[PDB]
Amino acid sequence: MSLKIVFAGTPQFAVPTLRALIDSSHRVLAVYTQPDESPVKEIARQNEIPIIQPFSLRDEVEQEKLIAMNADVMVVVAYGLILPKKALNAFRLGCVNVHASLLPRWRGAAPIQRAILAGDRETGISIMQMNEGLDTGDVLAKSACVISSEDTAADLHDRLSLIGADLLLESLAKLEKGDIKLEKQDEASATYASKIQKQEALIDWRKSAVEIARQVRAFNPTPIAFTYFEGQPMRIWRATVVDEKTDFEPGVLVDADKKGISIAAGSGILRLHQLQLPGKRVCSAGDFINAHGDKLIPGKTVFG
Ligand SMILES: [K+]
């Protein structure tokens, strides 16, 4: 077989897919990446692939340089530039994307965070035929994976990055054989995974400990969930749920121990394990107690 491919991508999520193309018999003619370096640029250089870094793909020059490549297909993974209509019609197999959700669920920029935040028990990868809309293209293939209550967005990101590489490669093979079954997106099931707004990262202590814990997981490593302590913002990096009833109001301190800073939520208890005060390194519950223990009064203190 062997296809001629232009690859476009920037952050670490894209690397495994690029590496899979590099390790295959397909020919990666060029790699497009953010101007300066990205993880993608590094792997391109290590493998003798020409590196193109336009600031914009609407510019006449850059647009025609791309369409003039004579690739069979363009593969796009986490690329920051919008692809112009001509770019999309440039190659016979079009532009194919590796999207980190099970479309039509979680179209948009933050599908990993949003899936975890919602308590989805599974998510996955969709290989998508790109068009001029936002993640509305036909789905060439899907592969699902479980989300565990242990997973942060970082963990899920890494898992999906590998699944995406394998699926993309398998899909390009079926795509050149003409063995792929298109799945048009069911608009009724479509949901949008927009970027996490800062206010969304604020912990609402009235919510269930279970809901807050999902927020803490979803938002690690960005933007990190946060609450307030002694008038100052406090980022919560690691937490766990304790399914025990309290008489205390939401946000009220239950107990402070090396095992965690236990806080009453609207139901159950959230236990803080790793946290961060302004301009300070992230610290354990034990460290925090050593520094600020005199301000930790069970039944009185109050977070948020
Ligand atoms: K190759």
From Swiss-Prot:
Disulfide bonds: none annotated. GO terms for molecular function: methionyl-tRNA formyltransferase activity. GO terms for cellular component: cytosol. It is an enzyme of class 2 (transferase). GO terms for biological process: conversion of methionyl-tRNA to N-formyl-methionyl-tRNA. Keywords: Protein biosynthesis, Transferase. (6S)-5,6,7,8-tetrahydrofolate binds at S101, L102, L103, P104. It holds the Pfam family Formyl_trans_C. PROSITE patterns: GART (PS00373). It catalyses: L-methionyl-tRNA(fMet) + (6R)-10-formyltetrahydrofolate = N-formyl-L-methionyl-tRNA(fMet) + (6S)-5,6,7,8-tetrahydrofolate + H(+). Its EC number is 2.1.2.9. Attaches a formyl group to the free amino group of methionyl-tRNA(fMet). The formyl group appears to play a dual role in the initiator identity of N-formylmethionyl-tRNA by promoting its recognition by IF2 and preventing the misappropriation of this tRNA by the elongation apparatus. Belongs to the Fmt family. This is Methionyl-tRNA formyltransferase. It comes from Coxiella burnetii (strain RSA 493 / Nine Mile phase I). The gene is fmt.
